[PDB]
Amino acid sequence: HHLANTSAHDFSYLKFVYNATDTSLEGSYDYIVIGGGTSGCPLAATLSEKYKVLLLERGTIATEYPNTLTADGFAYNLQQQDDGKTPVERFVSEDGIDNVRARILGGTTIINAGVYARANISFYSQTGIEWDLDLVNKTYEWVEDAIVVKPNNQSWQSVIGEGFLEAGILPDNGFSLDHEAGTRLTGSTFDNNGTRHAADELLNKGDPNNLLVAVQASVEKILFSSNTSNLSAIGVIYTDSDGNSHQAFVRGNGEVIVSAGTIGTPQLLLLSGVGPESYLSSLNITVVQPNPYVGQFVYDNPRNFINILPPNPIEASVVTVLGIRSDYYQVSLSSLPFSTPPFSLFPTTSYPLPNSTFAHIVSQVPGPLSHGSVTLNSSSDVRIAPNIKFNYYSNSTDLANCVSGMKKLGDLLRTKALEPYKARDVLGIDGFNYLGVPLPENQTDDASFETFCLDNVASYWHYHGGSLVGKVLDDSFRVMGIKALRVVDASTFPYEPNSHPQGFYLMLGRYVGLQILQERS
Ligand SMILES: Cc1cc2nc3c(=O)[nH]c(=O)nc-3n(C[C@H](O)[C@H](O)[C@H](O)COP(=O)(O)OP(=O)(O)OC[C@H]3O[C@@H](n4cnc5c(N)ncnc54)[C@H](O)[C@@H]3O)c2cc1C
Numbered sequence: 001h002h003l004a005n006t007s008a009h010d011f012s013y014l015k016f017v018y019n020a021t022d023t024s025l026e027g028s029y030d031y032i033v034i035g036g037g038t039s040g041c042p043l044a045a046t047l048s049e050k051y052k053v054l055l056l057e058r059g060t061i062a063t064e065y066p067n068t069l070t071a072d073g074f075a076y077n078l079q080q081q082d083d084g085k086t087p088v089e090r091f092v093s094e095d096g097i098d099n100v101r102a103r104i105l106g107g108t109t110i111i112n113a114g115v116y117a118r119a120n121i122s123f124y125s126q127t128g129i130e131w132d133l134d135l136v137n138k139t140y141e142w143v144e145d146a147i148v149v150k151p152n153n154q155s156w157q158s159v160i161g162e163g164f165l166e167a168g169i170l171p172d173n174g175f176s177l178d179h180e181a182g183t184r185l186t187g188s189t190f191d192n193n194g195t196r197h198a199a200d201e202l203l204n205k206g207d208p209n210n211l212l213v214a215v216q217a218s219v220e221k222i223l224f225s226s227n228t229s230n231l232s233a234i235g236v237i238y239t240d241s242d243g244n245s246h247q248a249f250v251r252g253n254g255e256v257i258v259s260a261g262t263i264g265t266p267q268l269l270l271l272s273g274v275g276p277e278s279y280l281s282s283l284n285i286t287v288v289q290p291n292p293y294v295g296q297f298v299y300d301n302p303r304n305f306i307n308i309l310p311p312n313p314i315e316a317s318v319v320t321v322l323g324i325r326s327d328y329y330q331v332s333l334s335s336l337p338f339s340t341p342p343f344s345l346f347p348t349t350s351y352p353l354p355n356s357t358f359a360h361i362v363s364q365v366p367g368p369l370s371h372g373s374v375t376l377n378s379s380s381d382v383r384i385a386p387n388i389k390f391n392y393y394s395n396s397t398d399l400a401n402c403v404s405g406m407k408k409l410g411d412l413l414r415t416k417a418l419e420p421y422k423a424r425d426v427l428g429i430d431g432f433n434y435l436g437v438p439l440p441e442n443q444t445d446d447a448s449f450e451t452f453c454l455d456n457v458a459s460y461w462h463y464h465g466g467s468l469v470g471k472v473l474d475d476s477f478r479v480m481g482i483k484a485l486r487v488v489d490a491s492t493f494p495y496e497p498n499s500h501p502q503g504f505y506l507m508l509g510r511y512v513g514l515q516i517l518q519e520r521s
């Protein structure tokens, strides 16, 4: 009933968006939210219902990059070179796996693949947080009313769904937003006219008299009270696009919330002296609050895949059909050929280029159990990306789950559903033409599947952790030991909420905003 309709991207909120060069944005606020992204935008909009809010985003507005605003533009933004101003910031983990993060108002919802899902209902009790489950669901509906649709039919997504069901990914769940075992059509933040809807549009739910947004605002330090006896965050330093510095503060019972993402939040905490004592001391960063876990327990769920090249063209699609098991989450994207690769779609730049249409058939490892860290490259410059290592497949359970997922992709390639897409009508799956590495020969050779998993891993782009609840934060998302400082974004949990987490983190931004308001009343 509540889902959104086909509609233009709503930029009405630009009336309270300003360049960070404007010094009249400096001053005192009730709340400062750092990072105008997936959690940050609904958080800021929610707080602004009652209080004065400054939202600071390092990127510009999405209208500057029109290919972020359509389903057809997804590949373009990844193909585009990173000049330091583009909405996609490229990086390579220390593992050697290419990756991207967002740099734009709206955050990663402006560049992502649009898949919308609610969290696995078991996630809430898994965390042990005392969730208000009725409020969680009302908050999902608030997001979904604004930016989520039921997708129309797409031929390739329907093929893949028939294949998942035939391969035993049961039951058939029809259309459902919920992360449950089986095959389903889920929601999308692309509407059925191809228009991208995103977290920035949730700013339209803020009070235009109370919410201010500064763009091209690079937040480089959190400021703290000089009296440490009662240590509190008091404000931030940020620089504008011309390089000049600015300061903003919170007042009274207000708070600073960091929503700068898995990469940005631990980086800013470390730069600000919140983190592991001997590490920060080794950089001659004065320790404000020692905590061994800042930038620790950083996770990237592996993506493994094969690419088939059908002998007749298939239609490009956005991902809407999901095949879910407890030990693997599977989808498929169909794509036009390209001569410039979308960066990080494949794990390195030396990957073969497709000359015809292809299906990217994908499996995601849950968890994962392997983890690494975010550490500083520069001890002063927040615009220099931190070092990030994920330690893919260091935990053997992850590898075992990849093996299981790849065997299930073999089952999928053997379905009647996928048979019309073979180049040769032979009995085996070698009748497909493959871009890149095909699935290993014999399913009895687990060592061949393990080698395939290890050598051909890519990022699923769903990385998380680095400021975990229970390590850096309490159950109210407050940074332990520091007053008036919280963290709300994907740095907060060590496991996925589901196969596609934007829906959870959109919800979380508003949910924690409501908790902050209730606490204050
Ligand atoms: C290519 C790609 C595709 C994806 N597709 C999907 C999908 O289809 N479905 C799904 O559910 N999930 C998808 N995801 C994952 C999901 O979108 C992200 O996990 C989620 O959006 C992260 O939200 P966040 O609030 O933690 O971070 P973000 O949304 O990235 O927000 C962080 C914001 O903080 C800003 N920032 C950072 N540092 C600073 C600073 N110092 N000062 C000021 N601002 C700062 C950043 O510019 C950014 O806007 C995808 C991810 C990627 C990379």
Ligand SMILES: *[C@@H]1O[C@H](CO)[C@@H](O[C@@H]2O[C@H](CO)[C@@H](O)[C@H](O)[C@H]2NC(C)=O)[C@H](O)[C@H]1NC(C)=O
Pocket: 120, 121, 122, 123, 126, 179, 180, 181, 324, 325, 326, 327
């Ligand atoms: C939803 O999340 C729950 C909780 O994490 C997952 O439950 C686990 O399921 C596996 C396989 O059944 C078990 O080995 C674990 O012991 C379960 N843990 C708990 C705490 O129950 C469940 O797999 C997830 N469901 C899906 C479809 O991903």
Ligand SMILES: *[C@@H]1O[C@H](CO)[C@@H](O)[C@H](O)[C@H]1NC(C)=O
Pocket: 019, 020, 021, 060, 061, 215, 216, 241, 242
């Ligand atoms: C902010 O102003 C500077 C000039 O002072 C300009 O170069 C930059 O593009 C502006 N940014 C936005 C988002 O308007």
Ligand SMILES: *[C@@H]1O[C@H](CO)[C@@H](O)[C@H](O)[C@H]1NC(C)=O
Pocket: 118, 121, 133, 134, 137, 178
């Ligand atoms: C919340 O919604 C889910 C479906 O997403 C439903 O299964 C669950 O029962 C709801 N919980 C409450 C407390 O209403």
Ligand SMILES: *[C@@H]1O[C@H](CO)[C@@H](O)[C@H](O)[C@H]1NC(C)=O
Pocket: 282, 283, 284
């Ligand atoms: C830190 O400062 C001390 C001097 O106080 C110096 O000896 C040491 O080399 C410095 N280390 C770094 C990493 O700057």
Ligand SMILES: *[C@@H]1O[C@H](CO)[C@@H](O)[C@H](O)[C@H]1NC(C)=O
Pocket: 369, 370, 394, 395, 396, 397
């Ligand atoms: C793999 O992860 C699980 C969960 O954290 C842990 O119990 C196990 O010890 C890990 N294995 C290794 C080798 O670290």
Ligand SMILES: *[C@@H]1O[C@H](CO)[C@@H](O)[C@H](O)[C@H]1NC(C)=O
Pocket: 376, 377, 378, 387
């Ligand atoms: C900074 O990053 C580059 C490339 O990511 C790396 O080669 C270099 O070693 C890093 N430097 C520090 C001091 O971490």
